[PDB]
Design a protein around this ligand. Structure first.
Ligand SMILES: CC(C)C(=O)N1CCC(NC(=O)Nc2ccc(C(F)(F)F)cc2)CC1
Ligand SMILES: CC(C)C(=O)N1CCC(NC(=O)Nc2ccc(C(F)(F)F)cc2)CC1
Ligand SMILES: [Mg+2]
Ligand SMILES: [Mg+2]
Lengths: 548, 548
């Protein structure tokens, strides 16, 4: 029984600038007797203030005075006085926020966990009731939600170097000492582990630390590539449900706090298309609500084609905002989601805090030209005609849902799905394989997630979005004298061969402060093709344009 | 066919300081030629800038310059100049926010609607893309969600005095002109109505306006009592679902934006117990999440008794926060909810932004005394023993769910449910009626809502909360050296004969900055007994203690 577990210290291992390294730092800053503070801190030993703290017996605020008091007499015996504007509260405040996640370490904990390793945190921590306690609280969710366990001293009532806590850890890990690795910055904290037969690593500089793990675990950890952003596990999400209308209920997934951000996916997808942006943006400081749009998934998908014109669709969201209590929301859409977002900007500005589109441009309708005409004047939009006749297009998509999704979600350098002559050919897939190979963009499981969803209600509803060309052309002509003068971002994908980035080139005529973003080497499925830069671009524009 | 509909102007009828009354006000403020501004505004008539605005042809920001331009030459012909620091943007900004809901008018629209009247708003409004557009956007949800319809000019493409919009209204109202009353502040806006045969009222001072309606409708509207806060319609709520654990999913209802506020109900209730506080608090500036607590309703209710000790229950919420992306939340509980909130404060401060209890005090456990002992030393807690033996208590409650809820939810001056000798008597209801009369606190329907919920999973789970006295006593003794030093409010109910307000009198010993609130003339069911003062007390403490 060799390794299958990985346990991490917090202060000094997963989170850096470690507090204790300020403990001292300060002394120096203030010409204090070397270590004075650090004695006060450890004063009493097992039966001292700081242990009681770490055990949960008392709380951070309860402890501040006991520390200061200890400090008093650490300096009385050292025949000295403290400064007269001296503050234990300030020190720890600065220190506790000063401290940020150690990124490579976390990334290595991911890497291991990605490969079957049960991961946990073991840390000597306290019950934080400081007026400013949230900052730490914030950091803990960011961490903990990447581990099997988080074991805190003040939570379990035992401390770290006391044996019984390691016993507690093993118990939690469902494991035996030789199956487990444990990293820490204090040597005293290491020894007990070993005595039971644990692999241990003294963490000093972080990346020799990694070397040791790397070796003893037999897994590239250092210098491992940049990894995809955090995905979502549907079963561990908050699912929301709003019946927006007698027989239309809309489903969404919700994570985060702050300014509401609404993500609207394109043809044939699900809220899952945003799996990479949800934790990212939530993390960046927002409340994300990722819709199943009408017709998809756990939202309702009513048969009638009218039920899917832009105008109807738009009111429904406005209701969605209504029934949730939201006066505004930032709207980011992709593919079809793109155009809808655009029409929320043009018809309900008071409701749209800011607006954002991946790939899908804004084209104002040509009030002379019919749109069934307009599409015909363009080889690549030939597929949209194929989609008009109710039923034809559905049988082909529904026929094999794996084949179908597998044939769509593929990256630029990867295709087995082409664009035109689609009506002559008489199939979207007329000339593609029955068992198409996995794209670099999707696991097998991910594809099956989609297969579940679309077993519910098929493509009738989704394919309906293409069946209101006429009505939407008309609706759209109402807005022909307007302009978008609210925060608005147009993200273009180099190699999306349908939402081509030239199509967007005049958009600044009707949107004069339009900010932009552009993804090199990116096919149509933006959010799973180039998730990280997608996240990078979006968070930055939110922060600059959507906060205040 | 006499009246059954009621239609309201916005500016000057449902919302006061009407904008146009600033239009002029300003002129005076700045020694401008009387009405100069008001001409510029109406300049062009039907074919002018302001109509296009009102029709949706263009937008507020699009219009600002056209107005200023018009203003230029209204003053050129008046042989005059404007000031050199002159701003149409500022004026309307101040004006648009200056304007608040006309309360009595809205209240009268409620009153009528409460009595079978289809209510709507008809208003000449614009597409707001001002940098500061939310303020108005905010006001509109507050209003609109109390009406059958909101009909906006720029939304329908027709304007108010043009006939075709009235036709549009009738159509929407499913009504004929003589069945409808229409209030407005402009006479021109009145006339078309009448020509089709509509009852009309020129709104000047608001309460002669009311007199007219009062009479022509034959319904007390003026001087009508203070009305209960807005309730929730379950079907028009956002329902959320978090599986917090393999087979425990927690349900909640969510409304609002801002700092998260978590409401936790007491024995045997539902998130519906907060029906009066949800819109109120949401409205006050918060994101409310009202739980079905474990054991109730659409949350999971697993059989085992352990599954309901405070410690288990607490982690589950902490998870709930986790899986929703919330670092903190304000916790307000009632009855059992009260105690749980308290233990969230004592065991997870980093997570509790602030803490609040209705009725339920904080008592620290007596580490010498057993609690099964402790309860016995008190006539009134005799019922808790009745609840210990699994099954006995459930058959009696489940036997008749109407009888049961109807027998509980009753106000102080109202009872048919007593407290003690409950074991000897051998029933909670041993001596109450089979068809108990409706309390002033509940409609019949409301009772049935509860009956639905509890048909799902009965009282096993809820009654379990009383079956971990021992375990919780133990858990609780861990916190005996701690204190609550976070924002914390103890709301006491005069006439709650079990959560008596003396029981809370030493709480300041362990909570030294505890703020308080106190409800005269209030039984145990605080939130439906005294909703308005409940809302008043809570919002004020949130604003002062929970914002920053
Ligand atoms: C102004 C135009 C570009 C616009 O707003 N549009 C038209 C184009 C539309 N998007 C798509 O057609 N997307 C799409 C997605 C998937 C496929 C499929 F996979 F080929 F079937 C084909 C097309 C989005 C809305
Ligand atoms: C410290 C004590 C007071 C405490 O925290 N407690 C004990 C009392 C408990 N609340 C109740 O017993 N509530 C209640 C509610 C309803 C009934 C019933 F309707 F009689 F059945 C009876 C009792 C709430 C938690
Ligand atoms: Mg450490
Ligand atoms: Mg008016």
């Amino acid at each position: 029984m060799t390794l299958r577990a990985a346990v991490f210290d917090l202060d000094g291992v997963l989170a850096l600038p470690a507090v204790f390294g300020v403990l001292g730092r300060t002394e120096e800053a203030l010409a204090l007797p070397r270590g004075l503070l650090n004695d006060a801190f450890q004063k009493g030993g097992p039966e001292g203030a700081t242990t009681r703290l770490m055990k949960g017996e008392i709380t951070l605020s309860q402890w501040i005075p006991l520390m200061e008091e200890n400090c008093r007499k650490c300096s009385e015996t050292a025949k000295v006085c403290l400064p007269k504007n001296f503050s234990i509260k300030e020190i720890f405040d600065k220190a506790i926020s000063a401290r940020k996640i150690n990124r490579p370490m976390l990334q290595a904990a991911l890497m291991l966990r990605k490969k079957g390793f049960t991961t946990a945190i073991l840390t000597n921590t306290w019950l934080d009731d400081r007026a400013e306690r949230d900052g730490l609280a914030q950091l803990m969710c960011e961490l903990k939600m990447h581990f099997d366990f988080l074991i805190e001293s003040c939570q379990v009532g035992m401390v770290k170097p006391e044996p019984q806590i390691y016993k507690f850890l093993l118990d939690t890990l469902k494991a035996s000492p030789s199956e487990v690795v444990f990293l820490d910055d204090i040597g005293a904290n290491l020894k007990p582990a070993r005595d039971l037969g644990m692999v241990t690593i003294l963490v000093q500089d972080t990346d020799t630390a990694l070397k040791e793990l790397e070796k003893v675990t037999g897994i590239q950890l250092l210098n491992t590539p940049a990894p995809l952003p955090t995905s979502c596990n549907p079963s561990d999400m908050s699912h929301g449900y709003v019946t927006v209308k007698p027989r239309v209920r809309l489903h969404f997934v919700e994570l985060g706090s702050g300014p509401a951000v609404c993500l609207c996916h394109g043809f044939p997808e699900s809220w899952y298309s945003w799996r990479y942006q949800i934790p990212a943006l939530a993390q960046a400081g927002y409340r994300v609500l990722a819709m199943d749009m009408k017709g998809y998934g756990e939202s309702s998908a009513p048969p009638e084609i009218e039920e899917y014109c832009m105008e109807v669709l738009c009111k429904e969201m406005v209701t969605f905002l209504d029934k949730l209590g939201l006066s505004q929301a930032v709207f980011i859409g992709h593919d079809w989601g793109g155009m809808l977002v655009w029409y929320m900007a043009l018809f309900y500005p008071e409701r749209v805090r800011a607006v954002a589109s991946l790939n899908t441009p804004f084209i104002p309708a040509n009030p002379n030209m019919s749109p069934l005409e307009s599409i015909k004047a363009n080889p690549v939009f030939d597929y949209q005609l194929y989609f008009q006749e109710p039923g034809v297009a559905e049988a082909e998509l529904e026929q094999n849902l794996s084949r179908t999704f597998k044939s769509l979600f593929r990256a630029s350098d990867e295709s087995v799905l082409s664009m035109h002559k689609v009506c002559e050919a008489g199939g979207l897939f007329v000339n593609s394989p029955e068992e198409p190979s996995l794209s670099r963009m999707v696991t097998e499981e991910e594809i099956q997630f989609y297969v579940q969803q679309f077993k519910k209600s098929g493509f009738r509803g989704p394919l309906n979005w293409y069946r209101n060309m006429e009505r939407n052309w008309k609706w759209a002509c109402k807005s022909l004298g307007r302009k978008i003068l609210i925060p608005a971002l147009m993200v273009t994908a180099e190699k999306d061969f349908v939402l081509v980035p030239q199509m967007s080139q005049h958009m600044e005529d009707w949107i004069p402060h339009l900010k932009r973003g552009h993804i090199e080497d990116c096919g149509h499925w933006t959010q799973m093709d180039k998730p990280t830069e997608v996240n990078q671009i979006l968070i930055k524009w939110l922060d600059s344009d959507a906060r205040n």
